[PDB]
C-alpha cells in the first residue's frame, strides 16, 4: 500500500503549454498585466 | 471444400531423369488407389525397376481381396453412423477390384511367364 512506480503530480489533461504553461503561478503571475493599457 | 486451407502441389523436380517415375502422368489420381498411375502415351514403352513394382503389388495385394472389400463395405457404415453427408449405403458399394479386373493383370505379368 505504497511506493508508486509513478511519482509526482504531473496532471493528466492540462498539457498544451500555450493555454497552460508548466510554470509555477508564483513565477507566472508576475506577467499578468495589472496595468494594461493598449487594448 | 472442407476448409479454406490452400492446396499446393509439391512435386520433385525433373522426372525425365528419374528411374521410377520416368514418364508418369499426374493430371488425375489412380482409379482405385491400388492401381499404378497413368503413363504418358508418348513413352508407353517403359518398364520399371522390379524391386519397386514387385513390392508395390505386394502392398496393393491386400485391397484386391474380399476382406478389404468387407472393410470397405463396413467403413461406409461408420461414416454414416458418424453421419457424413453423401456416403453410399454399404449395400451398393460393389468392390473396387474384381475378377473381371483380375484377368488383365495376371496376363499383364507376361514378363514372368
Amino acid at each position: 500500500k505504497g511506493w508508486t512506480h509513478n511519482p509526482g503530480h504531473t496532471r493528466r489533461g492540462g498539457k498544451n503549454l500555450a493555454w497552460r504553461p508548466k510554470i509555477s503561478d508564483a513565477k507566472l503571475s508576475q506577467f499578468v498585466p495589472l496595468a494594461l493599457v493598449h487594448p | 471444400r472442407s476448409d479454406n486451407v490452400a492446396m499446393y502441389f509439391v512435386e520433385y523436380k525433373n522426372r525425365d531423369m528419374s528411374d521410377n517415375h520416368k514418364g508418369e502422368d499426374y493430371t488425375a489420381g489412380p482409379e482405385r488407389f491400388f492401381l499404378p498411375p497413368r503413363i504418358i502415351e508418348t513413352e508407353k514403352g517403359i518398364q520399371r525397376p522390379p524391386h519397386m513394382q514387385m513390392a508395390f503389388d505386394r502392398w496393393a495385394s491386400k485391397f484386391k481381396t474380399e476382406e478389404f472389400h468387407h472393410w470397405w463395405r463396413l467403413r461406409h457404415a461408420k461414416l454414416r453412423y458418424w453421419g457424413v453427408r453423401n456416403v453410399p449405403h454399404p449395400s451398393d458399394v460393389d468392390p473396387l477390384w474384381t475378377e473381371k479386373e483380375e484377368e488383365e493383370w495376371h496376363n499383364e505379368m507376361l514378363a514372368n511367364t
Binding site: - | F9, E11, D25, Y26, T27, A28
Partner: protein, 55 residues
C-alpha cells in the same frame, strides 16, 4: 446486450471496410487458356500443361 438493436444499428455494421472487404468484393479473374475455365492468378490446375507452364 442490455438493448435490442434497430436496423440503423445493424446497418452501421455494413459500412466499415471490414464487412465490405470480407463479403462484398468481386475477385479479379480471367480465362485459363488451357482449361477455358475462369481462374484467379497465382493458382493452377492439377494437370501437366497447367503445371509446367503456369497459364
Amino acid at each position: 446486450p442490455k438493448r435490442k438493436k434497430n436496423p440503423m444499428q445493424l446497418r452501421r455494421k455494413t459500412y466499415g471496410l471490414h464487412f465490405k472487404e470480407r463479403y462484398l468484393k468481386l475477385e479479379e479473374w480471367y480465362f485459363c487458356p488451357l482449361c477455358a475455365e475462369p481462374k484467379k492468378q497465382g493458382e493452377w490446375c492439377r494437370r501437366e500443361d497447367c503445371r509446367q507452364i503456369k497459364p
